[PDB]
């Protein structure tokens, strides 16, 4: 399921990401654009048994359990496949777990390098909100 920016903004705001730990809603929408291009089914295997999953690309060695990654920590205590749904709830709940503080969006490399310092607000301007 590929999302629209506004549809995704709306849904993320519905789940408490607006100003979560100080981060404005646009950060989240920007992170998703660069991580999975708004695709819930997105997946990405890395040069280590790990695979990033879903709209926010959650790692299988640390946060979810894909069953095929050596040293899975499963911190969100979730199977990586639940993160692959069209309803973002589980992906959101794990991400809120990952961002334990005001500098935690750094957990996403695309955000830190492609979003931080830019007008992320631009992604939600004109959206019903």
């Amino acid at each position, epitope marked *: 399921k590929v999302f629209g920016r506004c549809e995704l903004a709306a849904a993320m705001k519905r789940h408490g990401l607006d100003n979560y730990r*100080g981060y404005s809603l646009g950060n989240w929408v920007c992170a998703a654009k660069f991580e999975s291009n708004f695709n819930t089914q997105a997946t990405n295997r890395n040069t280590d048994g790990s695979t990033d999953y879903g709209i926010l690309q959650i790692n299988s060695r640390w946060w979810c359990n894909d069953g095929r990654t050596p040293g899975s920590r499963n911190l969100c205590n979730i199977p990586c496949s639940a993160l692959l749904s069209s309803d973002i709830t589980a992906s959101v709940n794990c991400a809120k777990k990952i961002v334990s503080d005001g500098n935690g969006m750094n957990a996403w490399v695309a955000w830190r390098n492609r979003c931080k*310092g830019t007008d992320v607000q631009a992604w939600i301007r004109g959206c019903r909100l």
Partner: antibody, heavy 116, light 107 residues
């Protein structure tokens, strides 16, 4: 330790083009924006414009045509250039870091007076 | 531009009083509003951002509220160090603007 410090000429005549510097430390210029704000003697704060982390700039609509903001990421400096100085430009000039839609750190400010 | 109308201009109050400063936006700024305090000859200091979030180190006696186009800063039991000037600023698109300010002086 995030700090922004301004440095300007102090007294200029309308016969000049103003250049103010803002040297920052404790953070990268590509990761944050820098706003420029002034405060005329005994008046309120006026927003002049900004430069985003990515180099893009935005300006106060009235002052747009006589302002120019640039930066040198490597020297950790942001510059405010202003032309056609009016005596109304006399003010204290500030540079402040923008971090996710709030100016969280401000330099001390530098006082500028426009003469004849 | 979205202009901000801040009121009142001055406020005389005593230590222990609770006061309210308001900023009305000429258009919806969607909660992208911050408040600053500026003391005698000092640079502005952020207090609240995103309408209701306190900056670090900022005491709980300060609280912000508002939505759409009416915004407020409430100070509960003013302390001697709260006297100074206060300003609101919007962060909805560009250009950004400030409110005219409020001088909070001792009664």
């Amino acid at each position: 330790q995030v700090q922004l410090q301004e440095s300007g000429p102090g007294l200029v005549a309308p016969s000049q083009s103003l250049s103010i510097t803002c040297t920052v430390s404790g953070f990268s210029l590509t990761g944050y924006g820098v706003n420029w704000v002034r405060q005329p003697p005994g008046k309120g704060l006026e927003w002049l414009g900004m430069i985003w982390g990515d180099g893009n700039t935005d300006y106060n609509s009235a002052l747009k045509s006589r302002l120019s903001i640039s930066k040198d990421n490597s020297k950790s400096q942001v510059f405010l250039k202003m032309n056609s100085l009016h005596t109304d430009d006399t003010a204290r000039y500030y540079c402040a870091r923008e971090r996710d839609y709030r100016l969280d750190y401000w330099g001390q400010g530098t006082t500028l007076t426009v003469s004849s | 531009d979205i202009v901000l109308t801040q009121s009142p201009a001055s406020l005389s109050a005593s230590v222990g009083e609770t006061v309210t400063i308001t900023c009305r936006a000429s258009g919806n700024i969607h909660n992208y509003l911050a408040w600053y305090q500026q003391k005698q000859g000092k640079s502005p200091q952020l207090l609240v951002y995103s309408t209701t979030t306190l900056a670090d180190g900022v005491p709980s006696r300060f609280s912000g509220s508002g939505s759409g186009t009416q915004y407020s800063l409430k100070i509960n039991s003013l302390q001697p160090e709260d006297f100074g000037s206060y300003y609101c600023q919007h962060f909805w698109s560009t250009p950004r603007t400030f409110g005219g300010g409020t001088k909070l002086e001792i009664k």
